[PDB]
């Protein structure tokens, strides 16, 4: 039995998305070729934050991805940041940012 994500060439369980997209009441009918497209954009988006995370965790000289690496990953990007504009994060804090008039005279 060839799995649907493997014939799509992905990792995300497209059966799980196809099971959720029926019961989530987003329509009364969902195309078979629909949630394969949703699995790809999810596996793209989960990769793209995480690739920028593992860049930042590399700079902190650690192997473990920690929530401090996440918030510094998302805010440092611009285009990702506007997606997660109003979105907060847990345990993340804020990017280091000094305003210009804060330095002493």
């Amino acid at each position: 039995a060839k799995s649907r994500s493997n014939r799509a060439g992905l990792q995300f369980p497209v059966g799980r998305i196809h099971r959720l997209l029926r019961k989530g009441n987003y329509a009364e009918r969902v195309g078979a070729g629909a949630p394969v497209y949703l699995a790809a954009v999810m596996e793209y988006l989960a990769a793209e934050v995480l690739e920028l995370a593992g860049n930042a965790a590399r700079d902190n000289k650690k192997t473990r991805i920690i929530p401090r690496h996440l918030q510094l990953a998302i805010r440092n990007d611009e285009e990702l940041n506007k997606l997660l504009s109003g979105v907060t994060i847990a345990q993340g804090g804020v990017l280091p940012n000094i305003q210009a008039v804060l330095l002493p005279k």
């Binding site: 994060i89 804090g93 940012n97 330095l103």
Partner: protein, 98 residues
């Protein structure tokens, strides 16, 4: 003895607290505040031990998102200190005291 220049210790705490990520309000004063407004709203309520934890970082990231914002107004009035008209400007633009 030796006293530092004023502000310069405060500037060190900026770089100490921007690089760190721990919670900045003690848990038990935050928790006992929560239960007070709870039974004011409806009584006989208990809390999950992680439920106040997200509630803390809800308020704390909101308060940083206010304070980092209200710093920009005090710069805009050519000052370096915030005053209660600065934070009063902040929620008026944001959509509370419109």
């Amino acid at each position: 003895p030796h006293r530092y220049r004023p502000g310069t210790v405060a500037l060190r705490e900026i770089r100490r607290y921007q690089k760190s990520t721990e919670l900045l309000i003690r848990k038990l004063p935050f928790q006992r505040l929560v239960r007070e407004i709870a039974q004011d709203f409806k009584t006989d309520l208990r809390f999950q031990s992680s439920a106040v934890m997200a509630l803390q970082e809800a308020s704390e990231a909101y308060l940083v998102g206010l304070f980092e914002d209200t710093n920009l107004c005090a710069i805009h009035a050519k000052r370096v200190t915030i005053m209660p008209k600065d934070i009063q400007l902040a929620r008026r633009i944001r959509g509370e005291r419109a």
